[PDB]
Amino acid sequence: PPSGYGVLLATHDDDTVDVFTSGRKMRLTCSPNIDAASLKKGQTVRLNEALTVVEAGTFEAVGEISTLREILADGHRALVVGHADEERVVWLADPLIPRKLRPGDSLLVDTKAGYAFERIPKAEVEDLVLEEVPDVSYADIGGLSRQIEQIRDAVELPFLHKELYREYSLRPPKGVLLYGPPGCGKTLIAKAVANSLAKKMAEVRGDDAHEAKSYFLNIKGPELLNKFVGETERHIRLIFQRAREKASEGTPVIVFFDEMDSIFRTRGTGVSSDVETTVVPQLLSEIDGVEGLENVIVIGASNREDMIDPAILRPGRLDVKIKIERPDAEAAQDIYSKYLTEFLPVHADDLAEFDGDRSACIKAMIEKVVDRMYAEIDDNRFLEVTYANGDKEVMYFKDFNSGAMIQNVVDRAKKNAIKSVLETGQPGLRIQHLLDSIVDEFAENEDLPNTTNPDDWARISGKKGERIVYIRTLVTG
Amino acid sequence: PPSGYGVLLATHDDDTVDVFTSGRKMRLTCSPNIDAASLKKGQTVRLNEALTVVEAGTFEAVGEISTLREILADGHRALVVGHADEERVVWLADPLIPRKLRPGDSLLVDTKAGYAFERIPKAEVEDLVLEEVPDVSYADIGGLSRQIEQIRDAVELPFLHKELYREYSLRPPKGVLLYGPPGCGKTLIAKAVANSLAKKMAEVRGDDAHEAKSYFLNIKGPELLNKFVGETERHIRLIFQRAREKASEGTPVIVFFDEMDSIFRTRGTGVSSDVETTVVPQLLSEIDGVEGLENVIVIGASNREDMIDPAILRPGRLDVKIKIERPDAEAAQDIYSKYLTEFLPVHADDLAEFDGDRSACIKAMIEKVVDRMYAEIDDNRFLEVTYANGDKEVMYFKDFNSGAMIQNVVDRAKKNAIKSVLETGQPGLRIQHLLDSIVDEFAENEDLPNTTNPDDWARISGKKGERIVYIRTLVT
């Protein structure tokens, strides 16, 4: 009994329905074995030689993918385009009346029948926004306890305790600005936040694999720039639409604008370039516009907050401002403890003074290196700053410490230890290696300063009250 | 049971009808049940294996769409161009022979049959921006009464009293501009007027939400800019044609342009690109020209008043230039009243002194907090503006205040209260929390200003007569 197939079009009260079969629309009745009321629009139905419906199947078909333009007002038809710029009106299938249909999403359609059976999600895919989940967590960051607590309260706390916020009628923050001097650590906090969000999406909800990758859309500054008129705005609109559609109630979606300073410069600044007067308005309109974000947090990291446009830094778009400060002695000790773990090989001669106590030996070495870096001696005298009044203020290397510098010191000490292992054969790490690494780094950073340098005047002249007019390098050699 | 279908073409006096079916045109006889008088050209009919018309039906609803090219003299036919530049003469069905089928309309058509039925463009995506109507109304905006009065007189008043305007021969304003410092509340009014218009359309015409939302368009700014030459101007022309079509001298259509400086400039300030040099004349012609928009109101919001082209900032295009100023003490009190609602939980410590009177306690707290933030004390000193003349001026945090800052302070106070109730278990917002939030906010927004900022210092420099040369943060 050969049985054919056709596409259901509409249902009627006479228990008879219209089916597109063999390229023609036929009004046919239904067999008693199948309910006509249970049928749905755009359904693949089975027929026979007598032209009678006997079975209805799934909405599976092979069809061309057309870019959705707009749904009609009646809500049953939509306009789509084709490869040859051919526009057609097509009825929506039952599953497409499910996430809200949006323009720019490919729909599988057969032009002969004009039915969009399903929507292909992978056709509109963005891999540039997706970022690999870093291994860094909150425990791997030290010396920024207040900043970590503040960012936790800004991001994770509202979604963990939603009933209390609803009771107090409080909405989650709509933007965080992490800013500070170079090397003090801003990408690290972003990595920790991304890892925490990945854990929350993986183990707390248990949706599936790769779900963590979907959240935390990461984009850098220069990535958005294109070579066209009104194309970067298209990228902004697409990424914000993706963030809006992916976010749900209590579901946090974070967009990270790493290196915020370079892009989105203050409007009217920069003779050479003019892209700001187009990119910045789009961002200002997407965030806190006529239609606002529901559960989207925008995180911006910048070494030059002053350079960022004042219209975006005002409350309502970047509410929580977090400033990363240069490490002090206690922060330096914490950072060193974050790197000089007990798993590093220690020389037997190193452990001799403490009878093999690795923890005490490491703590003592950390204290010694911190004291060496934070000692005001002629060895640590870096620069002298002379103002208009003529008074000289001596700035040491301690004023230019950073987590990157500490990591480089530790890595240089490890490299020197491995060189000692290769040459002399004695394994382990030595405190004198750390002292030599300190000396080498502070001697290497001697030629960095120039006549005018950034990041120091805003923190020095404010307390001094005098404009910086000269900087002199101290004793050489 | 097996019955075919076909498309009606024309009728005759012989009780015969021409039907297109199976890719061929035939002439057929109607069943006695159906009367040929009620038939109209283009109607879909049902056939049978005996080839007899049995019942009429609604017109076809899907198929290829083809832009209308021209209307023929007879009126029964029109020339339409296909997707690949193919031109065909096709009959006009009954529904098109409502709003005139003006040229430039992509008409739904069947090439094989040769008949038209309907049309539409991409400008409707603007209506898709306002899918959700904001619930904020004029009652939720505080500190602005003259501005709200002006915006109501510009929009709601002309349509509230048509006869009075007709007697005085006065037409509704063609355009409204809103300008002011960032965060002062321009978008609040922009969305409140849209909410009011949606409410009016829902209550007057019909309860359907889509039609009510269809009378407000949200440009969003640089959304018009396109890759290809001459397509953005076509988009603007389509938007204004859509606006003019919905107008009926009693139903306003509000097209809201956000961040006017994004797409409008002085035609010479463009350095990297000069797309505005072509965009601006198109909009100027659309707004006022040989044919002028009778009943369309254009509302623009911007943060840079001067950067807009002088032609747009002209009477007859942007009639009323509403200026929104930074809140004063009374405006701050109004905003705090709008935010610190009476229903918020309050600690029993605060209610002990005022016998649990929530309203009086909240009013006293609002007055105390606004007095604290509007205080000329050395702790509130922010910047020292200098001039070539030498009249150094000390500015306070109160000068750089807005409704957004007040909302942020309230949110921070609520967060502190929620942290306190989580750690200790005693609920209720406290007065000291607001003071702590104020000082923390003024500390957080300290190192904002750059070397030179034309945001709001240009007006002060012009007032003093000299230009700013140095500014420093006066903290510690």
């Binding site: 070579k227 008129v229 892209v275 | 530049d85 890759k227 030459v229 990297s272 690109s273 797309v275």
Partner: peptide, 17 residues
């Protein structure tokens, strides 16, 4: 040498079936 954007102009293509 200020960097400048561009706007392209499409050329029609001939396609049958």
């Amino acid at each position: 040498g200020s960097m400048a954007q561009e706007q392209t102009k499409r050329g029609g293509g001939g396609g049958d079936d």
